[PDB]
Design a protein around this nucleic acid. Structure first.
Ligand code: NA
Ligand code: NA
Length: 327
DNA sequence: CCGACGTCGCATCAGC
DNA sequence: GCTGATGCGA
DNA sequence: GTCGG
């Protein structure tokens, strides 16, 4: 399925989604459009009518109508209008800054602040996160080539092991599934000394070391279990410096680690199926634990998990490599 | 018709 | 000052 | 906005 099949349609729907999220602040509408865009993007035929599209799950009456108008006119009157609405297009844009959500964007535009330039003029109105988001606006919208992700991973695993050889670290996301590019780096971290029935220092030590060797450059947020920040690969002499990247690191208890790894490896659609299949076999799977479901739906204690495979076994499923988990 | 549409850590705000 | 709500991100 | 109890 190529992007010239129904690209005009999926762009239209994706645009509408962003306005629902960022302007109308209707997150469920945003996801509805998003889902419709995805199901059409996977549809291997040039859509001829809204009725045809309506047969797909996620495409209802109103999107069918919008597709009709698009096919017949090449545009959407409502979308055309909101594009040239200076207030709405400004609110929608500012949300592209990490830290600026729908509410902050609305406030800024209310008081005249519409552009990156305007944001730079008003540092004192930005929180810490938003300043970093502004500072690295361009870098953050860049994708990360797998080769750089590998170089980044090299540094993370090396420094983590150097802090304490017993730490376990796993870079997840689409990267673990072998994607040729990434949007950020998501690191899951654990230590044998840290369980559910349990130092409040295990994350700090790792963040500190990666700061000491100047891999981590900024901090968006940091607590005892969750770090969110910025990193950058070292400059190779004369070569042009690498873009600053987003990196998350979270500390998970050892007994919830592999449920954590599984979930944050994805993909989203694969996770859905695996949870769907798990219920059939009488198990509830979430991000933290896998639990058995008694005859009336009463969940019992979390079952012990010591690897990803352990989960697959519990639910009579064959272990699938991250490579083969796109659905 | 009408509720669901994931969940929660951290930063910060609103209230007391 | 403290506790709980909200915004944000993922 | 879409689905479905
Ligand atoms: Na439908
Ligand atoms: Na944002």
């Amino acid at each position: 399925p190529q992007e010239t099949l129904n690209g005009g349609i999926t762009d239209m729907l994706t645009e509408l989604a962003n306005f629902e999220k960022n302007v109308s602040q209707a997150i469920h509408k945003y996801n509805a459009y998003r889902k419709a865009a995805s199901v059409i993007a996977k549809y291997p035929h040039k859509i001829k009518s809204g009725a045809e599209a309506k047969k797909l799950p996620g495409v209802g009456t109103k999107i069918a109508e919008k597709i009709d108008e698009f096919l017949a006119t090449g545009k959407l009157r409502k979308l055309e209008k909101i594009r040239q609405d200076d207030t709405s297009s400004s609110i929608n844009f500012l949300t592209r800054v990490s830290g600026i959500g729908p509410s902050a964007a609305r406030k800024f535009v209310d008081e005249g602040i519409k552009t990156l330039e305007d944001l730079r003029k008003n540092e004192d109105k930005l929180n810490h996160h938003q300043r970093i988001g502004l500072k690295y606006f361009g870098d953050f919208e860049k994708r990360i080539p797998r080769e750089e992700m590998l170089q980044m991973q090299d540094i993370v695993l090396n420094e983590v092991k150097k802090v304490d050889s017993e730490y376990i670290a796993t870079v997840c996301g689409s990267f673990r599934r072998g994607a040729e590019s990434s949007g950020d780096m998501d690191v899951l971290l654990t230590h044998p000394s840290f369980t559910s029935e349990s130092q409040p220092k295990l994350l700090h030590q790792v963040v500190e070391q990666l700061q000491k060797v100047h891999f981590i450059t900024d901090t968006l947020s940091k607590g005892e279990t969750k770090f969110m920040g910025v990193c950058q690969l070292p400059s190779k002499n004369d070569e042009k410096e690498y873009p600053h990247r987003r990196i998350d690191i979270r500390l998970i208890p050892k007994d919830q680690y592999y449920c954590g790894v599984l979930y944050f490896t994805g993909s989203d659609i694969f996770n859905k199926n695996m949870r769907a299949h798990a219920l059939e076999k009488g198990f509830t799977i979430n991000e933290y634990t896998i639990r058995p479901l008694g005859v009336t739906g009463v969940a019992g204690e979390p079952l012990p998990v010591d690897s990803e495979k352990d989960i697959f076994d519990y639910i009579q499923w064959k272990y699938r490599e991250p490579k083969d988990r796109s659905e």
